[PDB]
Structure formats: structure tokens, C-alpha cells
Amino acid sequence: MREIVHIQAGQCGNQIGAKFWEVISDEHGIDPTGSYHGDSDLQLERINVYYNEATGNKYVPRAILVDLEPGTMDSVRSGPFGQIFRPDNFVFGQSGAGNNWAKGHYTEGAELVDSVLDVVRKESESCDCLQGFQLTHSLGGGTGSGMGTLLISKIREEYPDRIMNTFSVMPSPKVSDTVVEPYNATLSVHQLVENTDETYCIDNEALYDICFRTLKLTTPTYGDLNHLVSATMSGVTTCLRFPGQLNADLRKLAVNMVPFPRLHFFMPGFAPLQQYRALTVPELTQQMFDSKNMMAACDPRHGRYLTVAAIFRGRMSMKEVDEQMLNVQNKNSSYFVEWIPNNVKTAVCDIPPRGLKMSATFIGNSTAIQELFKRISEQFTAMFRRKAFLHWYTGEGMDEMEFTEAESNMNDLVSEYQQYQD
Amino acid sequence: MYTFVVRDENSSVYAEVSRLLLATGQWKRLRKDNPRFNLMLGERNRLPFGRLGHEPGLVQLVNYYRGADKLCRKASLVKLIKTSPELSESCTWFPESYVIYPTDEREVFLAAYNRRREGREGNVWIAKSSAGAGILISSEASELLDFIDEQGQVHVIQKYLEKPLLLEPGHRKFDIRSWVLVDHLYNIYLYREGVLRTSSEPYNSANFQDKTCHLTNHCIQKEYSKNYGRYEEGNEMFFEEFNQYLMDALNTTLENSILLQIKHIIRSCLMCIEPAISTKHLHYQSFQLFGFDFMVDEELKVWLIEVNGAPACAQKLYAELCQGIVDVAISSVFPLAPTSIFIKLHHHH
Amino acid sequence: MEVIELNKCTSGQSFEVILKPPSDPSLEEIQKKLEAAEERRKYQEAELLKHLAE
Amino acid sequence: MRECISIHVGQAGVQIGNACWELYCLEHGIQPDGQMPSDKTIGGGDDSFNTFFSETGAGKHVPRAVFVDLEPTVIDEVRTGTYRQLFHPEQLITGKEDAANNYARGHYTIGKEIIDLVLDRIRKLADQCTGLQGFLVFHSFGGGTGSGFTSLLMERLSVDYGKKSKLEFSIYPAPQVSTAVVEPYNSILTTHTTLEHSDCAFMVDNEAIYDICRRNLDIERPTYTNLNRLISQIVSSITASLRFDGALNVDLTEFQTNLVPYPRIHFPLATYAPVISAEKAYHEQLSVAEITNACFEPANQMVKCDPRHGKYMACCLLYRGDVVPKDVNAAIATIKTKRSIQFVDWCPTGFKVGINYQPPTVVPGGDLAKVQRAVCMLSNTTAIAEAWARLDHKFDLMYAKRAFVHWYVGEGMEEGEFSEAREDMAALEKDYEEVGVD
């Protein structure tokens, strides 16, 4: 009974979080009212990982919805699976965070964080053996970024020896809401370097290009981008939610994915992305490793993989899977570090996602992720050198010194990635 | 797309093999430490065979047979010929030899030595070791043993061929180099092209002090000999010319008079150690190129001198021989997307 | 080629063939190790809590 | 009669233990409910099989075994499995979260808090033994529990049972059936601290078992069940002498005497034959000479390596089935004239042979065919040092960059224990070379 406590904060965090629970609820046979109606016992074997069991055979997600404004969470409660969430697990304010990291982290968020922890404490206390936490949020806004990282810090203070994972949406000028996003993202990245064990980096630019170029969506919407995020989040958690020869909790997974404590930022991928055609194993493996299928907006051919994990879902030839995986590495070994033996691992799951005969999810710890932090650091410095828009932050009590430190911290992170790429 | 690594930057042979593999556009070279490889061009010494054949899904091949040193070490070869039932009894093609440390065959050597001295027979021996460029030819036993104690490594004393076949004109010694390729299936391929490394000095059996006319090494002839390149370019005569010579001088052919014995000697040595080095049922595959060095006496009898495990090739033959390596040794295991240059010495496995 | 010490019973037999003749830390010390590692875990955690307190 | 207590640590040890005790029951005619019709002494006796089974007054034959795992999912397969009725609940010990493939976590963090409980349960089994021989300890090298907790247990067993032999069955890490990258660390850490505490250890390389299952059993992608059923046959062959009437390897002390001249070099190479697929139409029953010759083929070894380039220090032939001494010697002489068998000059060039007439037993509906005769060779070769070299090299690759080291330090382990354990493995590699190479 290795329970996980899920937290979703801010607009982005709650919209992606909502689609995630919608997706896996479907996979586990849970209807919008919380009643099970599947046809396989595999759907319930690990159901307690993400769902609490209530009276009358009800399954209630172990999820906490956090936001500094009511808007988005009112949408969740009225959405498809809105009724499935625990009424007491909606924790929200009225002021909002104004896309301001300082407001979410120091002023508005600080006033709300204690009641969020009360709910976290409540969920953890009813866990047979808490596996860890997962947070969905963006880094470019105010609540998910500033208050989200504050939450992580206070969770780590109270649960120092539990795994803390995040699905973190990285900003991009292409799909930008405000010009202060580089400020908010840089301030958050430093928090994550210290206080998360694994962070799946989701780049809205990569999601956009996949919708425009690969998926052929003329005008992508946040809904479209979130469909890819939901699908990815379901893939990475497949080994946690269904039985298989994997059998590994968050800590065991983190141990084999993270060789150095600060380099724990993953590039996820999914495949597939003329829609009823059967996709062969070669097509899954080639696409999954293709850059046009990854959501980090980074070219893996610019860095090297420290560790790579792949989850294949569906009834397929596991012999043919190994043949294709062992073909991609042995045909591109120049992009894998040679000093971590056997750093490419594969796992199969028989239950395919909804409406797909088979799929593959990709999780890469690549040094190419430094390009994502370089882009952010460049946008940050361009503004910070002129102190542009800083008054929104110094008006909340922050000093310029804290920005200088965050700038240095992320530049160190880039330097740390660069030395392992050589 | 096949991958290979290079771990001996001093191999002239596999420098060209590596140059040819890259030319096919279907072979990719990796850093020498990358374990994910199909073919290893390994180092001459301490090659880590124990780490081969453990990468999932990778068919791994190496250019050395683990255990072939038994054949390519002076003292090891002598011991193999004497302790192998396939050889010792009828090994009429290896000069009488004895392992001598500075177990040890000191007393046994002297017994055969006193026999020759007492029987008026030619009692000239040559002492040598694997640590040589350090050779000594002498007819007195005292000098041969005192020369080994001054050193500090194992030496072998074998009978010096006092009646070598001398080419004319010139009245000069020589030796024959034969290149043999053994693939993963243990087929024994003899390169159709050999080389005679000739001495440009007239053979003088009354002065074993000046070793220029006795040692036919390409380096000694190009260094201490004053007639280097007079008769043949680089003191190297190839089979076409040598065969024609045997027809004009002795009314015989290179095939009948010599090559039959060479083929028999190559098969005897390689078949003998096959059970101990074969990779047929192993988790990795081996092949290797060998340099067999022969002497020919005035009776047209062939003598095995030594076997080189890391041989070089004749400048004129690098192109053809190296292509043959890739053809039968590498591409046979890793195919790409004639009239073979080799001679298959068939045998029972 | 000699067989020696042939032992026979209803469930089997055994023997020996010769082809050729020839030619701790105490309980206390284990406690110290375990508690030393525990102490280093306590110290590292105290440094984290100190960091979070700052 | 002298009792043997089996200890199964971690997932690999537990599941292999599960497969062995299933096989033992089928070999001794013990039903899943614990009853044994052929046992005429009810609730008592000092028969050979009583070395591994005790008996209740109600006629139940209870394995002298303890199962230990830091997380319960694997042992619950035993609590509810076919043979759930064989074990008392106290024999199955499970924590709530595992060592996360972290030796430091299994040895220090979690081991410290569960060791005394495990000793207490083991003590309760020892108190039923009138003459305890020692322990058989099953575990993996790569697991955080199998590596970390085992080495702690071995240290404490040397304290509490100084005069008792300890034998290991260790699962050597293979990438083809593993999703972990830190197993080289755990392997070297556990071998270092366990070395002076284990009298004899049989390493099984998953790479070898995997290939034997693909090659001989035509299993495209073997599972752990396929691997464990095969491994249990070899284990059964090794422990048969302790459970059946006989004169060879009748107590654990005899394993060291016949297989380990030098204490640190206590890792015999195991070879088994034949492994025949059950789905086969009908195989030709192999002869004594043939299955004996198979013992010198690298493809039938539990650890892939080339014994032709090592030296033998000892050699045991264990036959089960229709085998008579006449056929064994005939096959032996034939093999000495064809194979490369170099013994160390300070050890007789001989073979201790044991024959058990009962042919190999196979789990009904399993992958292994019923054969009329099988053999397991236990030979102490320097060739097995290849496995240490391979594993030590992988350790070096990662340790040069300190990759993953922080996970061990975070659990209270000092970085110095890495290099201390590595230098011990370097000395172990040197020992093999001083015995093997000239």
C-alpha cells in the first residue's frame, strides 16, 4: 500500500491536474461519481496508490487542489470529473497572485499555505505507507510557481524523508502569458534544484510545435496542450498504477534515474502522436526517441543521456521491443554517457491507454535540458540587467540580491550540466 | 550500422582495416572505452577477454584468440610441441629446441650437445628470447649458457640451420613469411601471397660473429647490411619471383617443394590448439591474423621458426590482405548492405 | 585412475577418483557502526532543518 | 541428524526460496498441507529430510526456513500461495518499504531496526535443532535488501553462531533482467562485508540462466518463474546430499572442505546438464558421458566464463538418476583426453563424485522435461574471477564520477566505505591471479 499524495496548484497546475485525474480515472474504471465499473482486476490491484477507498466502494482521488483565486477550481468542480474530488481538498483564496512569484511565495501564498498543509497532513495520516508527493504546476505564473515551491519547502520540512516529484510546465515566449515569466521560472527552478527528487520538465513550446507541426493543429489551445500532458502523465505513472514485473516505488525509481542530486530534471516523451492504423514496435521506438515527440523543447542530439527509461503499454512482442530498444542505443551510442553501464532501461505493461492498441512513454535524464535553462537564464538576465519590471517584486518585500542569487544558481546548474556532457 | 573500437594504435594491419570499415559507410568507430561495440581491435597485451560478450543484444567479435600466445611465445611454442601428442612424436619440422631459464631444460640440452660434439656433427646453436629486438649464434655451449645468465628472461636454444637454402647469385640466406587468417568458425585461411625476407650478404658459415648474413630480419638488413636492396627491393622477394627461381634453378615449383610443407605445418599448429582457444560455443567470437616464419634448408625441407601473433605485412600487400580480413573475418559475422585471395586449409574440427 | 572411499546405500553411492597426485567484529563493534551511520543521518537532517529554518 | 536453517532475503531470495521449497516438497513427497504419507514416524524422526523439515504433532512437515523482505508484496505470494499451509506466520517477515536498491538503506537505515527481530525468529528455529549445522542464505547482489541487509545478517550470525557454517546462494546482477544501474555498487559493498563471514558461496549469474532458458527451453523472453524453477534445480542438486541418504557433502562443513582450500576464494562454479525443454516432442535421453562432457561447456555454466583459461582447485560431480560409478569413470577418462583441465599444482587432480538414484524431479506443468539422469558439477576455478573483473569494472566506471554516491551517503554511509570495499575486491582479484596465472 504505497500511497502517493497529489497536489495541483494554480491555473495551469489545476487544469493539467484535472485532465490527469480524468485520464487515469478512465483507465482504472472509475466513473465521474467515484464508482468503479471496469472489467478487469488489474484496474484495482494498485488503485489505492492514487485513490482512497470510501464507504460504499467509492474511490476518491488523494488529490489537493490549491489556488489563490477561485476561478480555475470552480471550473474543476463543474468539469467532467469534478464531483469525484473530496470537497474538503479544495483550498483556495480570493486575492490571486497576479502572475507574481513573490505574491505566491512570500505574501499572498504565505497566508494560505498553512491550511493547505493541514489537508496534506490529513491525507498523509491516513496512508498505510506514504510513498511520496507529486505536484502539478507551471513555473511562469504566480500561484503554481511561487506558492507551489513554497509548499514543496514546507512539505519537505515536515516530511524530510519522502520523495517529492513535480510535473513542471516551463514557460516560453511563444506561448507566454506575461513578460515576467522568466523571473518567475528562474526563481522557481532554484527551489526545485534543492527540494525535488524528480521534476518532469514540460515545455509549452514543445507542446505547441507538436500540435502545430506533428498533430497538424492550425490553432492550438491550452486544452490541446493539456491532452499531451495528461497522456504523458499517465504514461510515466503506468508502472506505479498497474501490476507488472517493474514493482518499484518512487524512491527506487529516483535512485536509478538520478546520478547527481541537482541533475534531476527529466525530458518526457510519448508516442504515438490515418489514425486507426496499427503502429508497429519500430514506429513506437523511432518516434519515442525522435525530438519531435518530446516535450522539453530540447534537441537530445545536443547533449547526452545520463539515464533513459521507457514504458511500453499494450500486448506486443517484448522480444521485438528489446530488439528495437537495443537497436536505438547501439545505433546512436554517441548520445549516451559511457560511464553509467546499462543506463537504458525498458518496461512493458499489458494495459494500453484508452483508444490505443499500444503506446510508449519516454523518460530521459539528458544533459540537453541545459538548453532549456539557458533560454530562461538569457531572458531573465536581459530584463534583470535593466531592472525591468522588478518593482512588482520589490513591492512585495523582495530585494535585488535574491534575484542575483537565483541568476547565479541557475547558471551554476547549466555549468553543472555542461561538465557532464563532456 | 555496426560499431567497432580501436585499442592498438600501433597496428599497421588494423589501422587499414579500420580505414576500410569507415569507408564502407556502414561501420562507425567509437571511443576505445565504449563497451557497446560489435568488433574490437584489441590491444596486444592483457586484452580483457573476460568483458566480451556480456552486452545484451550485441554480437561481439575480437581480433585475437584468447590462448594463442601458447603458439606465439618462443618458450611456450617449444613446450607445446614437446608436450602435445599431436606434435612431439613426429614433429620433424621444428628444430631441436630447449627452454632455458637464467621447468628448465639445462641438463637435457647439454646431453644433446655433448652428443653432437662427440659425433663430429655440426654443433652450432642459436639462443634467443621473446624480449629481443638480443640474439647469439655460437658453436660452443659455454657461450650460449653464459649469454643467458647475463640476461634475466627465459631463453630458448635451438639448432641453427647450418645448411640453409641459398639464393643465387649472392649465396644468401632468407626466410619465408606466411600470413594465415583464422575466422570465428576456425577455418584456416592461408594468404596466397607470402614474402621471402632475404639477406643481402653472402652466407658465411665460418663467422657467426657478424650476424648480418645470418639474421634475415627486415630491420637488421636495412640497418647493418651494406647491400640492402641490391637484388630485390627491400630484401623482399615475392612468390611469383621465388617460384620462377625454383623452376630455373632446381626444376621444381614453390607449391611442390615448399608450400605443401608450409600448409601442413600451419594446420598442425592450429588444429593442435583448436580445442583450447576455439570460440565456437563461447559468448563472444574470435578471429586472428598470424605471421608464420619458415626456414628452408638445402634439401628443400621446410622448418618452422616461430609464429607471430601481432604480425606486420609487406607494404605492397597491405591493401589486398586487409580487404581480405574484412571480407572473411569481419563481414562474415557482420554482413554489409573473386577468386578469394586466401587458401582454405580444410580440416576436421 | 584410482577409485577410493566407495560408499553405497539404498538411495545412492559416492566415491573419489584421483587422476594424479598433487605436487570477526563483535556485537559491540557492529552496534557502533550502525549507530555511527544513524548519527550521520541525524546530522545531515539537522543541517537540512537548519537550512529550512533559515 | 543435523539441521540446516534456510534464510531468504529480498525479492530474489524469497522467490527462489519459494521455488526450492516447492521442489523439496515434490522430492520428499510432502503435500501442500504439510502432510507426508511416506513418513511413518508422526510428529518426530531424525531422517535425512528432517535436516530441512521439522514435524508437528499433527503430522505437518514445516520447513526450517525464514523469509525476510523489507516490503511485503513478494512474501504475500507465499502467505497465500499453494504452500501457504507449510509455514507458520512468524516465519514470514515483511517491512513496509524496501531499500530502494540502496545497500546503505538496507544495511544501515532499515537493517538497524529489523535485525534483532530477524535474529529472534531465527533463534526460535535454532531452539528446535539438536545439532544445527549452519545456515543457507539466499539473496541477490543488486537488491538493497539482498545486498545490504544480508551482509548485516551475516555479521550478526557470525557473532551469535560462531561455530556454524554459512553458505550463500547469490544472484549476480545481469542487465537483461534488471532495471537498476546501481547494482555494481551494491554487489561490491555486500561482497566486501560478507567475505569473511561466508564459508562458501554459489554465485548464479542471471545472464547465464537467461541464456539457458532462451537457448535450451526456447523461451523467447524468460520470466522470473522460468529463471527460479531452473535455479531451484541447481540448488536442489547442491542441497540434495543434506536431505537424502548419502556419504558426500553430508553436512555444510563438507562444502568448505571439498571446495574451498583458501577461505577468500570460496565461490565455486556451478554447471548443470541437461536442460531439456518440456514442449519438445521427445528428446533422446543423454548418457553419463554426454551430460558429464556438458559440464565443461561454457553454455551450461551458472556464471559465463572460460574455465579453459583458469586453474581448478577442487571439483565435485553430483549425479541424480540412473548413474553407476562404472559409467562415470569411463566418461571422466574420455574428457581428460579431450578437454583443457589445468589443476593447481598444490591440489590433487581428482574428482569427488556423488550419485543419488532418485532422478531429477520437475514441477508438473513446468518448462523442464523429466530426464533419466542429470549432473551438477561444482568446481572451484580461477576462471570465475572474470565475473569479479566484469563487475569491478562497472563499479569503476560509475565511481570515477561519484555517480549515485550521494544516495548512499544520504543514508549514513561514508564515502570511504566505497573505496575500502573496492580495494578489497582488487585484493580478491589479485588472489585469483596468484593462484591461476603463471
Ligand SMILES: Nc1nc2c(ncn2[C@@H]2O[C@H](COP(=O)(O)OP(=O)(O)OP(=O)(O)O)[C@@H](O)[C@H]2O)c(=O)[nH]1
Ligand atoms: N534469478 C532471479 N533474480 C531476481 C529475482 N528477483 C529479483 N532478481 C534480481 O535481483 C536484482 C534486484 O534485487 P531484488 O532482489 O529484486 O531487490 P531486494 O533484495 O528485494 O531489495 P530492495 O531494493 O529493497 O527491493 C536484479 O538483478 C534482479 O534481476 C528472482 O526472482 N530470480
Ligand SMILES: Nc1ncnc2c1ncn2[C@@H]1O[C@H](COP(=O)(O)OP(=O)(O)CP(=O)(O)O)[C@@H](O)[C@H]1O
Ligand atoms: N634455428 C635457426 N636456424 C637458422 N636461422 C635462424 C634460426 N633461428 C633464427 N634464425 C634466423 O633469425 C631470423 C628470425 O629470428 P626470430 O624470428 O627468432 O626473431 P624475431 O621473432 O625477433 C624476428 P620475427 O618475429 O619478425 O620473425 C630468421 O631470419 C633466421 O634467419
Ligand SMILES: Nc1nc2c(ncn2[C@@H]2O[C@H](COP(=O)(O)OP(=O)(O)O)[C@@H](O)[C@H]2O)c(=O)[nH]1
Ligand atoms: N500547458 C499549459 N500551460 C499553461 C496552462 N495554463 C497556464 N499555462 C502556462 O503557465 C504560465 C501561467 O501560469 P499560471 O498557471 O496561469 O499562473 P498561476 O495560476 O498563478 O499559477 C504560462 O507560462 C502559461 O503558458 C495550461 O492549461 N496548460
Ligand SMILES: CC(=O)N1CCN(c2ccc(Cl)cc2)CC1
Ligand atoms: C515515477 C518515476 O520516477 N518514473 C521514472 C522512472 N520510471 C521507469 C520506467 C521504466 C523503467 Cl524500466 C524504469 C524506470 C517510471 C517513472
Ligand SMILES: CC(=O)N1CCN(c2ccc(Cl)cc2)CC1
Ligand atoms: C504456539 C505456536 O503457534 N507456535 C508455532 C509457531 N511458532 C514459531 C515462532 C517463530 C518461528 Cl521462526 C517459527 C515458528 C511459535 C509457536
Ligand SMILES: [Ca+2]
Ligand atoms: Ca492578505
Ligand SMILES: [Ca+2]
Ligand atoms: Ca517423521
Ligand SMILES: [Ca+2]
Ligand atoms: Ca566466520
Ligand SMILES: [Mg+2]
Ligand atoms: Mg494564468
Ligand SMILES: [Mg+2]
Ligand atoms: Mg617474434
Ligand SMILES: [Mg+2]
Ligand atoms: Mg525488493
